[PDB]
Amino acid sequence: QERRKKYADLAIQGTNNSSIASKRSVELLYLPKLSSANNFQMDKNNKLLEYFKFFVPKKIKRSPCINRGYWLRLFAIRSRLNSIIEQTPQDKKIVVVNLGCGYDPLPFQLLDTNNIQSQQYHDRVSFIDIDYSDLLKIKIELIKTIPELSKIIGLSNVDFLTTPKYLARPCDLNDSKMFSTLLNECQLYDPNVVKVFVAEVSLAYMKPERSDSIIEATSKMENSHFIILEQLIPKGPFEPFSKQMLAHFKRNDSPLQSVLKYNTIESQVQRFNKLGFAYVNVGDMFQLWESADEATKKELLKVEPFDELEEFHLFCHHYVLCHATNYKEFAFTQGFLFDRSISEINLTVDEDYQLLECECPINRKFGDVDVAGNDVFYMGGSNPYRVNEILQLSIHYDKIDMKNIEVSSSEVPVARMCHTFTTISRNNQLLLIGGRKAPHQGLSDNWIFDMKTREWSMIKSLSHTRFRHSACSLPDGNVLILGGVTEGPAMLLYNVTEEIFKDVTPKDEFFQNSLVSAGLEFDPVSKQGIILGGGFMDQTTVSDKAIIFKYDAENATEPITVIKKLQHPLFQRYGSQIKYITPRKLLIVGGTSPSGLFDRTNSIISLDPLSETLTSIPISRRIWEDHSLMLAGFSLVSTTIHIIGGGATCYGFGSVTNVGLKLIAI
Numbered sequence: 001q002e003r004r005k006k007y008a009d010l011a012i013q014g015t016n017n018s019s020i021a022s023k024r025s026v027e028l029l030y031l032p033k034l035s036s037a038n039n040f041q042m043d044k045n046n047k048l049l050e051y052f053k054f055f056v057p058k059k060i061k062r063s064p065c066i067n068r069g070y071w072l073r074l075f076a077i078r079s080r081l082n083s084i085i086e087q088t089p090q091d092k093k094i095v096v097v098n099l100g101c102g103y104d105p106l107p108f109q110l111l112d113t114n115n116i117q118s119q120q121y122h123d124r125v126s127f128i129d130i131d132y133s134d135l136l137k138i139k140i141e142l143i144k145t146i147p148e149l150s151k152i153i154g155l156s157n158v159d160f161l162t163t164p165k166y167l168a169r170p171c172d173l174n175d176s177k178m179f180s181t182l183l184n185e186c187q188l189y190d191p192n193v194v195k196v197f198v199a200e201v202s203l204a205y206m207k208p209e210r211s212d213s214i215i216e217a218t219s220k221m222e223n224s225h226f227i228i229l230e231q232l233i234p235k236g237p238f239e240p241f242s243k244q245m246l247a248h249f250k251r252n253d254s255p256l257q258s259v260l261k262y263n264t265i266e267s268q269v270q271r272f273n274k275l276g277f278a279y280v281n282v283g284d285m286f287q288l289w290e291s292a293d294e295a296t297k298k299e300l301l302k303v304e305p306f307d308e309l310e311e312f313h314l315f316c317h318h319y320v321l322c323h324a325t326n327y328k329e330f331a332f333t334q335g336f337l338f339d340r341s342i343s344e345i346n347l348t349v350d351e352d353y354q355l356l357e358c359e360c361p362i363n364r365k366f367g368d369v370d371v372a373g374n375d376v377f378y379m380g381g382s383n384p385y386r387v388n389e390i391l392q393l394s395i396h397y398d399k400i401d402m403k404n405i406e407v408s409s410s411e412v413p414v415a416r417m418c419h420t421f422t423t424i425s426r427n428n429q430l431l432l433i434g435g436r437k438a439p440h441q442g443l444s445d446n447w448i449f450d451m452k453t454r455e456w457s458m459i460k461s462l463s464h465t466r467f468r469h470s471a472c473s474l475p476d477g478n479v480l481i482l483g484g485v486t487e488g489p490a491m492l493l494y495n496v497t498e499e500i501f502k503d504v505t506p507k508d509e510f511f512q513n514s515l516v517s518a519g520l521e522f523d524p525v526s527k528q529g530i531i532l533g534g535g536f537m538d539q540t541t542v543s544d545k546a547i548i549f550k551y552d553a554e555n556a557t558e559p560i561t562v563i564k565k566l567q568h569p570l571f572q573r574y575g576s577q578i579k580y581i582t583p584r585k586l587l588i589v590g591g592t593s594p595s596g597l598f599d600r601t602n603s604i605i606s607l608d609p610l611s612e613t614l615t616s617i618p619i620s621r622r623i624w625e626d627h628s629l630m631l632a633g634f635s636l637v638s639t640t641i642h643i644i645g646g647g648a649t650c651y652g653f654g655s656v657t658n659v660g661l662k663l664i665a666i
């Protein structure tokens, strides 16, 4: 009985351990590499100050995606708190109430007068940490036994603590009344003190009814802000990343319960109005990213090797930063304002092709595949480690077999991902271009694989390392190569016979910037090829264009010419793949968007290049829900098109292997 409670309670307190560690990882890596502005912590000698170390036993390291996610999270809260201090008139005290503080040292960081980066907070700001009794006992003993911390709050087996500028109050927030009492005992009813209630991924664990009570309670406090940061599931509990996230949390015995009722950014808005907060500014983590300045973006890219962007889009859309206010006075200046635009788009449901479940397990991602006549070859990729091995795929109406093809040559290309692999030499060979090992180790060495001899042999290398480029075979047998992370030409043509790479970048201002992970395909029939979506090396912008082009094999200086540009929000996708099913019907598949998650209806769409009309190829609920889907790092083969391979590491909520899909005629 009351045991079942004291367990689910300690499991929730356990999540602090996980998140304080991650924040510490950012203190170790990011903060030292960052300028004064996005710094957070620093003394007069431009020497970084450290606060998360007092609360974390060991040194910790995270994936570049988790590290980025947590920097954004600190920037999220800090930026909000900043808009408040800057604006609040100079005669009002300010109290930041941290609901479920964990070991969060935000108080000491902002109070410490050594830290010149938080000077606006030295004078007139005070803090109250609220959390379970046990977690605070521990936290309070540290604070007392650490001269650096104790000095900051004016100090020299309890669970409470009191100082002029900092309080810590034991309280189970599930207990609405006791919280209502705490609000009163802390004189937060006072109109001459601006309250800033922060719930950083804590109310997320409590039930909708119990968390909302906390919110309504605070709404009775005149002049109060409520900043909440927590998970969303903007397309239901069944969207690929949502599914994984939710399950991860049941596993830890600390499920997200409030998010089940509050799925979207919009529901969060209605929630706060309903509960006494009339004024609400709200966006998801990627709008925060977008909102960061160019000099900050530049820095953040250079902090550490990163190439896990699909993940980052997914993660970002699943965290909302909600800033609410219960008074008209406070303005959401244009510097802090989020834009909100859910433009529901209805697409005609394609009547010619449908989507089948193909249960096919190559269990790898970001390799490449291409068919040489009959046989189907997949090379490299990661599973989750990088390999240089070749699988052969036997595709049947039911499933696909696969066997390792061992090689006879001693020299072999190194394990690599994000390369291309393309049939050349009249289906007799396979071209391997570029790729990378670690994100900071892009490759310039190119190889060819001879099926007849099963020998690898390295050819002319690139002048510039290149990965995440796209590539397709042209009619004449040559290979068109498109962008990727690179310092070289935005478009290459590899003459297979001549053995030369040639810069064929079209004279359109579009190709000014290198296009990363865009869709690319040619059609020998309609004598046309398309380019779809694609991101830019700023890791922020994502093209929404679909660019038709023709290829004049004889024009030696400008073989490729931009025929026609199209523009649709559904074209805005990083890491998608396209393939002609018909010279009039261009299948488009997956990828991620900076502007929101894709769902059942628009994850897979068709395009009629000529008439310019889109149609949806829906994923049935049966497969949306039952089968682990993760259209990222995947490939398309045609015998009937197959969507095999792919997966993602869902922000340390585990990993998700794409199980396989099949497009058939109706």
Ligand SMILES: C[S@@+](CC[C@H](N)C(=O)[O-])C[C@H]1O[C@@H](n2cnc3c(N)ncnc32)[C@H](O)[C@@H]1O
Binding pocket: 012, 013, 015, 016, 019, 020, 099, 100, 101, 102, 103, 104, 130, 131, 132, 135, 171, 172, 173, 174, 199, 200, 201, 202, 203, 205, 206
């Ligand atoms: C994931 S930690 C985050 C804490 C802090 N905001 C941070 O990011 O480091 C969530 C915290 O909320 C606290 N919490 C959740 N529900 C609570 C409740 N009902 N009463 C008191 N504390 C609660 C937990 O004890 C935990 O320390």
